Amino acid sequence: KVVARVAEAYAEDVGKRVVRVDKYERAKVGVKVGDYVEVKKV
Amino acid sequence: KVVARVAEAYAEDVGKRVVRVDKYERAKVGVKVGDYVEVKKV
């Protein structure tokens, strides 16, 4: 399970169904920028 | 399942195991800022 702490979205991203994920979490999940991910509660 | 598009992390967040999620995705997931989430491939 790749788990990260939730931080508030930057204002310009609000309402766009976007999640900001860094290169480390992306590599573990197996995604690139522009891919989609599921977000779920721990 | 709550799904969002991956965007690049802001530089100040890189390496901190943080994901930026807006109030809409947070409400659907059932989390607040400070909570943890799993991120997984769709």
mmCIF file of all heavy atoms in Angstrom, chain A:
data_model
loop_
_atom_site.group_PDB
_atom_site.id
_atom_site.type_symbol
_atom_site.label_atom_id
_atom_site.label_comp_id
_atom_site.label_asym_id
_atom_site.label_seq_id
_atom_site.Cartn_x
_atom_site.Cartn_y
_atom_site.Cartn_z
ATOM 1 N N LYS A 1 0.855 -1.204 0.000
ATOM 2 C CA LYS A 1 0.000 0.000 0.000
ATOM 3 C C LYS A 1 0.882 1.243 0.000
ATOM 4 O O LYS A 1 1.732 1.344 0.830
ATOM 5 C CB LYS A 1 -0.758 0.089 1.320
ATOM 6 C CG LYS A 1 -2.101 -0.602 1.371
ATOM 7 C CD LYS A 1 -2.912 -0.149 2.566
ATOM 8 C CE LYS A 1 -4.055 -1.088 2.893
ATOM 9 N NZ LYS A 1 -5.016 -0.491 3.839
ATOM 10 N N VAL A 2 0.690 2.135 -0.950
ATOM 11 C CA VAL A 2 1.410 3.399 -0.945
ATOM 12 C C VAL A 2 0.512 4.422 -0.262
ATOM 13 O O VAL A 2 -0.594 4.704 -0.735
ATOM 14 C CB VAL A 2 1.781 3.838 -2.370
ATOM 15 C CG1 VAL A 2 2.589 5.118 -2.329
ATOM 16 C CG2 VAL A 2 2.556 2.726 -3.076
ATOM 17 N N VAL A 3 0.999 4.981 0.838
ATOM 18 C CA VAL A 3 0.200 5.836 1.705
ATOM 19 C C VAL A 3 0.889 7.187 1.861
ATOM 20 O O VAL A 3 2.104 7.255 2.050
ATOM 21 C CB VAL A 3 -0.017 5.153 3.071
ATOM 22 C CG1 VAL A 3 -0.618 6.127 4.069
ATOM 23 C CG2 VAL A 3 -0.921 3.956 2.887
ATOM 24 N N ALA A 4 0.099 8.262 1.773
ATOM 25 C CA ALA A 4 0.618 9.616 1.877
ATOM 26 C C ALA A 4 -0.313 10.455 2.741
ATOM 27 O O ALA A 4 -1.503 10.148 2.885
ATOM 28 C CB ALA A 4 0.757 10.274 0.492
ATOM 29 N N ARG A 5 0.240 11.524 3.295
ATOM 30 C CA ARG A 5 -0.528 12.450 4.118
ATOM 31 C C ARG A 5 -1.213 13.485 3.235
ATOM 32 O O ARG A 5 -0.626 14.000 2.278
ATOM 33 C CB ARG A 5 0.391 13.151 5.123
ATOM 34 C CG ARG A 5 -0.259 14.313 5.853
ATOM 35 C CD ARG A 5 0.601 14.817 7.017
ATOM 36 N NE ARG A 5 1.959 15.179 6.620
ATOM 37 C CZ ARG A 5 2.338 16.402 6.266
ATOM 38 N NH1 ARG A 5 1.457 17.393 6.242
ATOM 39 N NH2 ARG A 5 3.599 16.633 5.932
ATOM 40 N N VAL A 6 -2.469 13.772 3.557
ATOM 41 C CA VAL A 6 -3.267 14.691 2.757
ATOM 42 C C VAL A 6 -2.926 16.120 3.142
ATOM 43 O O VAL A 6 -2.986 16.493 4.318
ATOM 44 C CB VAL A 6 -4.761 14.411 2.969
ATOM 45 C CG1 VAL A 6 -5.602 15.478 2.295
ATOM 46 C CG2 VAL A 6 -5.108 13.034 2.447
ATOM 47 N N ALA A 7 -2.591 16.934 2.143
ATOM 48 C CA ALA A 7 -2.410 18.368 2.307
ATOM 49 C C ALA A 7 -3.440 19.105 1.459
ATOM 50 O O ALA A 7 -3.980 18.560 0.493
ATOM 51 C CB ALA A 7 -0.976 18.795 1.933
ATOM 52 N N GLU A 8 -3.701 20.355 1.829
ATOM 53 C CA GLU A 8 -4.707 21.150 1.132
ATOM 54 C C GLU A 8 -4.294 21.427 -0.310
ATOM 55 O O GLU A 8 -3.130 21.692 -0.607
ATOM 56 C CB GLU A 8 -4.922 22.472 1.876
ATOM 57 C CG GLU A 8 -6.010 23.366 1.266
ATOM 58 C CD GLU A 8 -7.387 22.718 1.274
ATOM 59 O OE1 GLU A 8 -8.064 22.807 2.312
ATOM 60 O OE2 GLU A 8 -7.784 22.113 0.257
ATOM 61 N N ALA A 9 -5.264 21.378 -1.221
ATOM 62 C CA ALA A 9 -4.971 21.654 -2.619
ATOM 63 C C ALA A 9 -4.635 23.121 -2.824
ATOM 64 O O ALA A 9 -5.243 24.009 -2.220
ATOM 65 C CB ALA A 9 -6.173 21.301 -3.491
ATOM 66 N N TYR A 10 -3.693 23.366 -3.725
ATOM 67 C CA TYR A 10 -3.403 24.754 -4.149
ATOM 68 C C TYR A 10 -4.652 25.284 -4.874
ATOM 69 O O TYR A 10 -5.299 24.561 -5.592
ATOM 70 C CB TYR A 10 -2.133 24.777 -5.001
ATOM 71 C CG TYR A 10 -0.905 24.331 -4.252
ATOM 72 C CD1 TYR A 10 -0.228 23.177 -4.606
ATOM 73 C CD2 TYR A 10 -0.489 24.988 -3.127
ATOM 74 C CE1 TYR A 10 0.880 22.741 -3.902
ATOM 75 C CE2 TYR A 10 0.636 24.597 -2.428
ATOM 76 C CZ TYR A 10 1.313 23.456 -2.807
ATOM 77 O OH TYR A 10 2.414 23.048 -2.115
ATOM 78 N N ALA A 11 -4.894 26.570 -4.729
ATOM 79 C CA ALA A 11 -6.146 27.158 -5.204
ATOM 80 C C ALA A 11 -6.368 26.915 -6.693
ATOM 81 O O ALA A 11 -7.504 26.654 -7.122
ATOM 82 C CB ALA A 11 -6.158 28.653 -4.897
ATOM 83 N N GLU A 12 -5.313 27.002 -7.486
ATOM 84 C CA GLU A 12 -5.483 26.862 -8.953
ATOM 85 C C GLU A 12 -5.857 25.422 -9.342
ATOM 86 O O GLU A 12 -6.392 25.250 -10.402
ATOM 87 C CB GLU A 12 -4.244 27.417 -9.656
ATOM 88 C CG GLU A 12 -2.936 26.860 -9.131
ATOM 89 C CD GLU A 12 -2.290 27.490 -7.902
ATOM 90 O OE1 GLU A 12 -3.009 27.994 -7.024
ATOM 91 O OE2 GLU A 12 -1.060 27.441 -7.819
ATOM 92 N N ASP A 13 -5.686 24.444 -8.460
ATOM 93 C CA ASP A 13 -6.034 23.062 -8.757
ATOM 94 C C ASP A 13 -7.431 22.683 -8.298
ATOM 95 O O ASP A 13 -7.914 21.609 -8.673
ATOM 96 C CB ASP A 13 -5.033 22.133 -8.071
ATOM 97 C CG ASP A 13 -3.638 22.317 -8.596
ATOM 98 O OD1 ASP A 13 -3.497 22.534 -9.822
ATOM 99 O OD2 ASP A 13 -2.690 22.254 -7.784
ATOM 100 N N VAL A 14 -8.096 23.533 -7.516
ATOM 101 C CA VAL A 14 -9.364 23.166 -6.895
ATOM 102 C C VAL A 14 -10.448 22.974 -7.960
ATOM 103 O O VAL A 14 -10.602 23.794 -8.872
ATOM 104 C CB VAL A 14 -9.773 24.215 -5.856
ATOM 105 C CG1 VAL A 14 -11.138 23.892 -5.282
ATOM 106 C CG2 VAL A 14 -8.730 24.287 -4.742
ATOM 107 N N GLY A 15 -11.202 21.886 -7.834
ATOM 108 C CA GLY A 15 -12.316 21.622 -8.726
ATOM 109 C C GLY A 15 -11.963 20.947 -10.027
ATOM 110 O O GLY A 15 -12.835 20.823 -10.899
ATOM 111 N N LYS A 16 -10.724 20.497 -10.185
ATOM 112 C CA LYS A 16 -10.241 19.906 -11.421
ATOM 113 C C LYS A 16 -10.028 18.405 -11.307
ATOM 114 O O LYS A 16 -9.527 17.795 -12.260
ATOM 115 C CB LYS A 16 -8.934 20.579 -11.844
ATOM 116 C CG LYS A 16 -9.050 22.075 -12.055
ATOM 117 C CD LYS A 16 -7.717 22.642 -12.521
ATOM 118 C CE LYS A 16 -7.854 24.055 -13.052
ATOM 119 N NZ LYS A 16 -6.534 24.574 -13.518
ATOM 120 N N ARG A 17 -10.386 17.811 -10.169
ATOM 121 C CA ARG A 17 -10.187 16.358 -9.932
ATOM 122 C C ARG A 17 -8.716 16.021 -10.164
ATOM 123 O O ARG A 17 -8.410 15.082 -10.858
ATOM 124 C CB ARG A 17 -11.084 15.494 -10.820
ATOM 125 C CG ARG A 17 -12.548 15.545 -10.440
ATOM 126 C CD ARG A 17 -13.357 14.686 -11.387
ATOM 127 N NE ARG A 17 -12.974 13.310 -11.210
ATOM 128 C CZ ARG A 17 -12.604 12.496 -12.189
ATOM 129 N NH1 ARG A 17 -12.579 12.922 -13.431
ATOM 130 N NH2 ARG A 17 -12.255 11.261 -11.913
ATOM 131 N N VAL A 18 -7.868 16.813 -9.541
ATOM 132 C CA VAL A 18 -6.401 16.658 -9.655
ATOM 133 C C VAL A 18 -5.829 16.328 -8.282
ATOM 134 O O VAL A 18 -6.356 16.795 -7.289
ATOM 135 C CB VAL A 18 -5.797 17.954 -10.214
ATOM 136 C CG1 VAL A 18 -4.333 18.090 -9.861
ATOM 137 C CG2 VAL A 18 -6.005 18.048 -11.712
ATOM 138 N N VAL A 19 -4.837 15.455 -8.255
ATOM 139 C CA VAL A 19 -4.082 15.196 -6.995
ATOM 140 C C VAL A 19 -2.600 15.352 -7.311
ATOM 141 O O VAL A 19 -2.145 14.805 -8.302
ATOM 142 C CB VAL A 19 -4.359 13.840 -6.329
ATOM 143 C CG1 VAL A 19 -5.758 13.779 -5.762
ATOM 144 C CG2 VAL A 19 -4.032 12.658 -7.226
ATOM 145 N N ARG A 20 -1.913 16.109 -6.475
ATOM 146 C CA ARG A 20 -0.478 16.348 -6.646
ATOM 147 C C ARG A 20 0.305 15.289 -5.888
ATOM 148 O O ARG A 20 0.158 15.166 -4.669
ATOM 149 C CB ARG A 20 -0.122 17.747 -6.134
ATOM 150 C CG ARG A 20 -0.870 18.892 -6.834
ATOM 151 C CD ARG A 20 0.043 19.581 -7.805
ATOM 152 N NE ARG A 20 -0.655 20.544 -8.652
ATOM 153 C CZ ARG A 20 -0.191 20.955 -9.823
ATOM 154 N NH1 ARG A 20 0.951 20.480 -10.292
ATOM 155 N NH2 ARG A 20 -0.888 21.823 -10.536
ATOM 156 N N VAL A 21 1.130 14.529 -6.615
ATOM 157 C CA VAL A 21 1.868 13.378 -6.116
ATOM 158 C C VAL A 21 3.304 13.507 -6.600
ATOM 159 O O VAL A 21 3.534 13.793 -7.781
ATOM 160 C CB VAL A 21 1.280 12.074 -6.682
ATOM 161 C CG1 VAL A 21 1.988 10.885 -6.058
ATOM 162 C CG2 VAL A 21 -0.203 12.014 -6.479
ATOM 163 N N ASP A 22 4.266 13.282 -5.707
ATOM 164 C CA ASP A 22 5.655 13.487 -6.111
ATOM 165 C C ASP A 22 6.235 12.242 -6.799
ATOM 166 O O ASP A 22 5.589 11.199 -6.919
ATOM 167 C CB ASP A 22 6.510 14.037 -4.960
ATOM 168 C CG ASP A 22 6.909 12.988 -3.922
ATOM 169 O OD1 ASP A 22 6.809 11.765 -4.168
ATOM 170 O OD2 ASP A 22 7.362 13.420 -2.832
ATOM 171 N N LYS A 23 7.478 12.376 -7.268
ATOM 172 C CA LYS A 23 8.099 11.314 -8.060
ATOM 173 C C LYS A 23 8.260 10.031 -7.263
ATOM 174 O O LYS A 23 8.282 8.939 -7.847
ATOM 175 C CB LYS A 23 9.473 11.761 -8.556
ATOM 176 C CG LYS A 23 10.403 12.265 -7.472
ATOM 177 C CD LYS A 23 11.713 12.728 -8.094
ATOM 178 C CE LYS A 23 12.763 13.044 -7.051
ATOM 179 N NZ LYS A 23 14.112 13.097 -7.677
ATOM 180 N N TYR A 24 8.388 10.138 -5.941
ATOM 181 C CA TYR A 24 8.592 8.943 -5.124
ATOM 182 C C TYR A 24 7.305 8.146 -5.003
ATOM 183 O O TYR A 24 7.277 6.943 -5.291
ATOM 184 C CB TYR A 24 9.122 9.338 -3.747
ATOM 185 C CG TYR A 24 10.395 10.147 -3.809
ATOM 186 C CD1 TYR A 24 10.415 11.489 -3.446
ATOM 187 C CD2 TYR A 24 11.585 9.556 -4.223
ATOM 188 C CE1 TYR A 24 11.588 12.221 -3.500
ATOM 189 C CE2 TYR A 24 12.757 10.280 -4.282
ATOM 190 C CZ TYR A 24 12.756 11.609 -3.920
ATOM 191 O OH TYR A 24 13.929 12.319 -3.984
ATOM 192 N N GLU A 25 6.220 8.801 -4.577
ATOM 193 C CA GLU A 25 4.929 8.122 -4.526
ATOM 194 C C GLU A 25 4.488 7.660 -5.910
ATOM 195 O O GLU A 25 3.937 6.566 -6.045
ATOM 196 C CB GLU A 25 3.862 9.012 -3.892
ATOM 197 C CG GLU A 25 3.689 8.810 -2.406
ATOM 198 C CD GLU A 25 4.883 9.290 -1.624
ATOM 199 O OE1 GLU A 25 5.224 10.485 -1.721
ATOM 200 O OE2 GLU A 25 5.488 8.467 -0.909
ATOM 201 N N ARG A 26 4.741 8.464 -6.953
ATOM 202 C CA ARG A 26 4.366 8.034 -8.301
ATOM 203 C C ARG A 26 5.095 6.757 -8.701
ATOM 204 O O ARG A 26 4.500 5.847 -9.291
ATOM 205 C CB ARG A 26 4.674 9.122 -9.324
ATOM 206 C CG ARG A 26 3.708 10.292 -9.321
ATOM 207 C CD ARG A 26 3.771 11.069 -10.623
ATOM 208 N NE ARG A 26 5.124 11.416 -11.055
ATOM 209 C CZ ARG A 26 5.739 12.550 -10.732
ATOM 210 N NH1 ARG A 26 5.143 13.426 -9.935
ATOM 211 N NH2 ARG A 26 6.957 12.805 -11.192
ATOM 212 N N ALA A 27 6.394 6.680 -8.394
ATOM 213 C CA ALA A 27 7.172 5.501 -8.762
ATOM 214 C C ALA A 27 6.661 4.262 -8.042
ATOM 215 O O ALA A 27 6.548 3.187 -8.642
ATOM 216 C CB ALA A 27 8.646 5.734 -8.446
ATOM 217 N N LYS A 28 6.307 4.406 -6.762
ATOM 218 C CA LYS A 28 5.797 3.270 -6.001
ATOM 219 C C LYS A 28 4.447 2.812 -6.538
ATOM 220 O O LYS A 28 4.189 1.607 -6.660
ATOM 221 C CB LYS A 28 5.672 3.656 -4.526
ATOM 222 C CG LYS A 28 6.996 3.978 -3.833
ATOM 223 C CD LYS A 28 6.760 4.486 -2.409
ATOM 224 C CE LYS A 28 8.063 4.727 -1.657
ATOM 225 N NZ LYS A 28 7.829 5.163 -0.251
ATOM 226 N N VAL A 29 3.566 3.762 -6.862
ATOM 227 C CA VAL A 29 2.235 3.435 -7.370
ATOM 228 C C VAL A 29 2.321 2.833 -8.768
ATOM 229 O O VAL A 29 1.526 1.958 -9.139
ATOM 230 C CB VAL A 29 1.342 4.695 -7.332
ATOM 231 C CG1 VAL A 29 0.010 4.440 -8.015
ATOM 232 C CG2 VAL A 29 1.111 5.131 -5.900
ATOM 233 N N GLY A 30 3.282 3.284 -9.560
ATOM 234 C CA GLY A 30 3.420 2.863 -10.933
ATOM 235 C C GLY A 30 2.739 3.773 -11.932
ATOM 236 O O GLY A 30 2.225 3.276 -12.944
ATOM 237 N N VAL A 31 2.725 5.081 -11.686
ATOM 238 C CA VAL A 31 2.030 6.032 -12.546
ATOM 239 C C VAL A 31 2.976 7.157 -12.936
ATOM 240 O O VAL A 31 4.026 7.371 -12.328
ATOM 241 C CB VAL A 31 0.752 6.619 -11.903
ATOM 242 C CG1 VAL A 31 -0.308 5.543 -11.706
ATOM 243 C CG2 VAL A 31 1.080 7.311 -10.582
ATOM 244 N N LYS A 32 2.587 7.863 -13.989
ATOM 245 C CA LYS A 32 3.224 9.093 -14.426
ATOM 246 C C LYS A 32 2.232 10.237 -14.290
ATOM 247 O O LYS A 32 1.030 10.036 -14.087
ATOM 248 C CB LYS A 32 3.669 8.977 -15.890
ATOM 249 C CG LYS A 32 4.575 7.788 -16.174
ATOM 250 C CD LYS A 32 5.927 7.954 -15.500
ATOM 251 C CE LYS A 32 6.792 6.713 -15.668
ATOM 252 N NZ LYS A 32 8.036 6.806 -14.851
ATOM 253 N N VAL A 33 2.755 11.459 -14.408
ATOM 254 C CA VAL A 33 1.871 12.614 -14.469
ATOM 255 C C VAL A 33 0.916 12.452 -15.641
ATOM 256 O O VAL A 33 1.303 12.039 -16.743
ATOM 257 C CB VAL A 33 2.710 13.903 -14.563
ATOM 258 C CG1 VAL A 33 1.832 15.095 -14.910
ATOM 259 C CG2 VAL A 33 3.473 14.145 -13.254
ATOM 260 N N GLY A 34 -0.362 12.736 -15.398
ATOM 261 C CA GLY A 34 -1.390 12.543 -16.394
ATOM 262 C C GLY A 34 -2.135 11.231 -16.283
ATOM 263 O O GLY A 34 -3.242 11.113 -16.819
ATOM 264 N N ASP A 35 -1.569 10.245 -15.597
ATOM 265 C CA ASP A 35 -2.321 9.050 -15.262
ATOM 266 C C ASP A 35 -3.331 9.371 -14.171
ATOM 267 O O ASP A 35 -3.332 10.450 -13.566
ATOM 268 C CB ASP A 35 -1.391 7.946 -14.750
ATOM 269 C CG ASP A 35 -0.642 7.243 -15.863
ATOM 270 O OD1 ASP A 35 -1.221 7.075 -16.956
ATOM 271 O OD2 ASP A 35 0.532 6.862 -15.641
ATOM 272 N N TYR A 36 -4.191 8.400 -13.901
ATOM 273 C CA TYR A 36 -5.195 8.523 -12.866
ATOM 274 C C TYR A 36 -4.900 7.543 -11.743
ATOM 275 O O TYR A 36 -4.317 6.477 -11.958
ATOM 276 C CB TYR A 36 -6.583 8.247 -13.451
ATOM 277 C CG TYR A 36 -7.025 9.341 -14.378
ATOM 278 C CD1 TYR A 36 -6.621 9.362 -15.709
ATOM 279 C CD2 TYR A 36 -7.853 10.359 -13.928
ATOM 280 C CE1 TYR A 36 -7.010 10.397 -16.553
ATOM 281 C CE2 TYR A 36 -8.249 11.384 -14.765
ATOM 282 C CZ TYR A 36 -7.825 11.394 -16.069
ATOM 283 O OH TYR A 36 -8.231 12.422 -16.891
ATOM 284 N N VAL A 37 -5.291 7.929 -10.535
ATOM 285 C CA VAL A 37 -5.100 7.097 -9.358
ATOM 286 C C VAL A 37 -6.392 7.084 -8.568
ATOM 287 O O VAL A 37 -7.193 8.026 -8.625
ATOM 288 C CB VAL A 37 -3.937 7.574 -8.458
ATOM 289 C CG1 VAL A 37 -2.591 7.332 -9.142
ATOM 290 C CG2 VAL A 37 -4.124 9.025 -8.056
ATOM 291 N N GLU A 38 -6.602 5.999 -7.833
ATOM 292 C CA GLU A 38 -7.662 5.952 -6.843
ATOM 293 C C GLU A 38 -7.103 6.470 -5.530
ATOM 294 O O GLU A 38 -5.950 6.188 -5.179
ATOM 295 C CB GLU A 38 -8.128 4.508 -6.660
ATOM 296 C CG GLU A 38 -9.400 4.353 -5.861
ATOM 297 C CD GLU A 38 -9.731 2.890 -5.601
ATOM 298 O OE1 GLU A 38 -9.218 2.021 -6.339
ATOM 299 O OE2 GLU A 38 -10.502 2.614 -4.663
ATOM 300 N N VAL A 39 -7.907 7.249 -4.817
ATOM 301 C CA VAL A 39 -7.564 7.729 -3.486
ATOM 302 C C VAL A 39 -8.567 7.139 -2.511
ATOM 303 O O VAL A 39 -9.781 7.231 -2.729
ATOM 304 C CB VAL A 39 -7.593 9.263 -3.428
ATOM 305 C CG1 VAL A 39 -7.275 9.741 -2.025
ATOM 306 C CG2 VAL A 39 -6.601 9.852 -4.422
ATOM 307 N N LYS A 40 -8.072 6.511 -1.447
ATOM 308 C CA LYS A 40 -8.979 5.907 -0.481
ATOM 309 C C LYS A 40 -8.453 6.097 0.932
ATOM 310 O O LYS A 40 -7.247 6.239 1.158
ATOM 311 C CB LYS A 40 -9.228 4.412 -0.741
ATOM 312 C CG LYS A 40 -7.964 3.581 -0.815
ATOM 313 C CD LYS A 40 -8.204 2.280 -1.565
ATOM 314 C CE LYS A 40 -9.085 1.332 -0.771
ATOM 315 N NZ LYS A 40 -8.860 -0.078 -1.194
ATOM 316 N N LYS A 41 -9.370 6.030 1.875
ATOM 317 C CA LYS A 41 -9.068 6.202 3.304
ATOM 318 C C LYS A 41 -8.229 5.032 3.774
ATOM 319 O O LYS A 41 -8.306 3.988 3.213
ATOM 320 C CB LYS A 41 -10.387 6.173 4.065
ATOM 321 C CG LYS A 41 -10.525 7.136 5.226
ATOM 322 C CD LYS A 41 -11.940 7.175 5.734
ATOM 323 C CE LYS A 41 -12.903 6.560 4.746
ATOM 324 N NZ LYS A 41 -14.325 6.777 5.094
ATOM 325 N N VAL A 42 -7.351 5.287 4.722
ATOM 326 C CA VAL A 42 -6.587 4.188 5.281
ATOM 327 C C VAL A 42 -7.464 3.382 6.248
ATOM 328 O O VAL A 42 -7.891 2.275 5.920
ATOM 329 C CB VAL A 42 -5.270 4.670 5.903
ATOM 330 C CG1 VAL A 42 -4.574 3.531 6.636
ATOM 331 C CG2 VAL A 42 -4.363 5.226 4.821
#
